[PDB]
Coordinates of C-alpha atoms in Angstrom, one line a residue:
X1 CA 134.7 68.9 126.3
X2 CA 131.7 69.5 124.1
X3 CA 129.4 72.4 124.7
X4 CA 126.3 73.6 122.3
X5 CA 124.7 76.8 121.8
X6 CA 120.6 76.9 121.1
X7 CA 118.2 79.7 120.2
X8 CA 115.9 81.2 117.9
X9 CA 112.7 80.7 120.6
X10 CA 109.5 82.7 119.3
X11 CA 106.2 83.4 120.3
X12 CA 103.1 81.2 118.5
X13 CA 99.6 80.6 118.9
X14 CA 98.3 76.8 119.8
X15 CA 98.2 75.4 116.6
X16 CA 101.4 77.3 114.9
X17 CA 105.1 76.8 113.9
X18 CA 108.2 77.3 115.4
X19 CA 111.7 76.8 113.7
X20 CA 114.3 76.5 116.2
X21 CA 117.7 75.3 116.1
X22 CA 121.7 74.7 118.1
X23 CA 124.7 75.4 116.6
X24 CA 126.8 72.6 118.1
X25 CA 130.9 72.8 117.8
X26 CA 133.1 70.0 118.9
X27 CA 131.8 66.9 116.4
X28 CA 130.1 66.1 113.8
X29 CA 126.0 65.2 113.4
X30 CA 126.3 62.6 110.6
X31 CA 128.4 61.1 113.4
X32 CA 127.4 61.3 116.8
X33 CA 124.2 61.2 118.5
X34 CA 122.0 64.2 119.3
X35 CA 118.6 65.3 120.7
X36 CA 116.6 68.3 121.4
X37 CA 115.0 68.7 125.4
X38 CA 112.8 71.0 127.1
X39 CA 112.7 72.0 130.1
X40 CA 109.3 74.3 131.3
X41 CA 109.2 76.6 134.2
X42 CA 111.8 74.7 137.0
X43 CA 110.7 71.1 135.6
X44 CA 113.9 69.1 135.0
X45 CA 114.2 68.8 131.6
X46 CA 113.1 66.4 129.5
X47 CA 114.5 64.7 126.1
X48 CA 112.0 65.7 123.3
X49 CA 113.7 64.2 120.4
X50 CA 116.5 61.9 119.5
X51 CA 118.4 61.6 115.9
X52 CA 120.8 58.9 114.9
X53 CA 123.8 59.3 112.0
X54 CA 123.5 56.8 109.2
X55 CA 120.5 55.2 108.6
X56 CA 117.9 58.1 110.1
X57 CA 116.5 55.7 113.1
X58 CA 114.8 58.2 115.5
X59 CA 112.8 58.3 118.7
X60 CA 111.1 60.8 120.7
X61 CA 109.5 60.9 124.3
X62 CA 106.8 59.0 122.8
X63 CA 104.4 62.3 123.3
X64 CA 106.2 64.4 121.2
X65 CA 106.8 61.6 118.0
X66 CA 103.7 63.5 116.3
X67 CA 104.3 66.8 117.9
X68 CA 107.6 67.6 117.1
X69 CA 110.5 67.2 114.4
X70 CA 114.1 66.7 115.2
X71 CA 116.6 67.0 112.3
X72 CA 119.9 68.3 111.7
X73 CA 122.5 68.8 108.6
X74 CA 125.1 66.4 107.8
X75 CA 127.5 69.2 107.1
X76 CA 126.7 72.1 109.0
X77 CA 127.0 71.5 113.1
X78 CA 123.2 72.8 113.7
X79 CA 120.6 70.4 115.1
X80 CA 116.8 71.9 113.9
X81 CA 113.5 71.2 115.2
X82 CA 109.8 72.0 114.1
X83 CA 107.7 72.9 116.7
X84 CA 103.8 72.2 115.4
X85 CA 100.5 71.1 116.9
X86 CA 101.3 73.3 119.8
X87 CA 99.1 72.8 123.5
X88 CA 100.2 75.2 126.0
X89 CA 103.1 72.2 126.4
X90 CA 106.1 73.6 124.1
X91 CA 105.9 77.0 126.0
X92 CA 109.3 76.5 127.6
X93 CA 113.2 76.3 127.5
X94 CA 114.6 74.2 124.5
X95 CA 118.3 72.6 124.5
X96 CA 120.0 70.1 122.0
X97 CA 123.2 67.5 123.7
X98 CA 124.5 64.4 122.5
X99 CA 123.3 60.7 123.9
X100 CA 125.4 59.0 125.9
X101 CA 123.4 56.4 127.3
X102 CA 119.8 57.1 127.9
X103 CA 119.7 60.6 128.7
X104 CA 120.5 64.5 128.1
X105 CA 123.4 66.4 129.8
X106 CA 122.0 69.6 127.6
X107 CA 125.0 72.2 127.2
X108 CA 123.2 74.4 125.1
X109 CA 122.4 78.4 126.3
X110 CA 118.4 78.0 126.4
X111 CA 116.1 78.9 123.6
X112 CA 113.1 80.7 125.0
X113 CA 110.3 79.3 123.2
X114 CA 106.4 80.3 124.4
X115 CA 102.8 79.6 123.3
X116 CA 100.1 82.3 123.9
X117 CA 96.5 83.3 121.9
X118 CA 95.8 87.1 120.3
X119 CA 99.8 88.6 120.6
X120 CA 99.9 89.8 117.2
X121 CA 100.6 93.4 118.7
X122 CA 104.1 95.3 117.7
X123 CA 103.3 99.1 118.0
X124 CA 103.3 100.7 114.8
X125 CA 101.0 103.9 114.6
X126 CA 102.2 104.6 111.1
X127 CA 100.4 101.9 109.1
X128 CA 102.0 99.0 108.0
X129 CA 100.9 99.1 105.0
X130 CA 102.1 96.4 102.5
X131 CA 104.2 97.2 99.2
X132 CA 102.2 100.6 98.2
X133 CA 105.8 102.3 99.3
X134 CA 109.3 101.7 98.6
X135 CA 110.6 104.8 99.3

């Protein structure tokens, strides 16, 4: 009936910021109920967030109300989430579904998010340089 798409997973260091988001497609947000869960290596998922149309009453998993923020666009099908104060716990598969109840079906594709310290390697050998070239 509905199904959801979620992505834009990155790699940041404990203590960072990480924009992800789901481009839903069957409904609309300022309408029905959403929420963004995680699921880290096998675990069994687990709802993160939770955002409700109208008035703006949210609710997390209670461990994640000062970790993470779940919002979304009343005209725009996307469901966003900031990923900060990070602890080795975010490292892991993100999805956003609606609420039907009390729990996540989660039909989004996976958003491979992960946490690690000193990655700021990309191979260049060529200097990066800055803005002293623009060719």
């Amino acid at each position: 009936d509905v199904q959801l798409q979620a992505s834009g997973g990155g790699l940041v260091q404990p203590g960072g910021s990480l924009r992800v988001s789901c481009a839903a497609s069957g409904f609309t947000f300022s309408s029905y109920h959403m929420a963004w869960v995680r699921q880290a290596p096998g675990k069994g998922l687990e709802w993160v967030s939770t955002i409700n149309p109208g008035d703006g009453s949210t609710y997390y998993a209670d461990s994640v109300k000062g970790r993470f923020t779940i919002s979304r666009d009343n005209a725009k099908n996307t469901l966003y989430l900031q990923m900060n104060s990070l602890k080795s716990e975010d490292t892991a598969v993100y999805y956003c579904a609606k609420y039907s109840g009390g729990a996540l079906d989660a039909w989004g594709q996976g958003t491979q998010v992960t946490v690690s310290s000193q990655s700021e390697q990309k191979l260049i050998s060529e200097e990066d340089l800055n803005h002293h070239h623009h060719h």
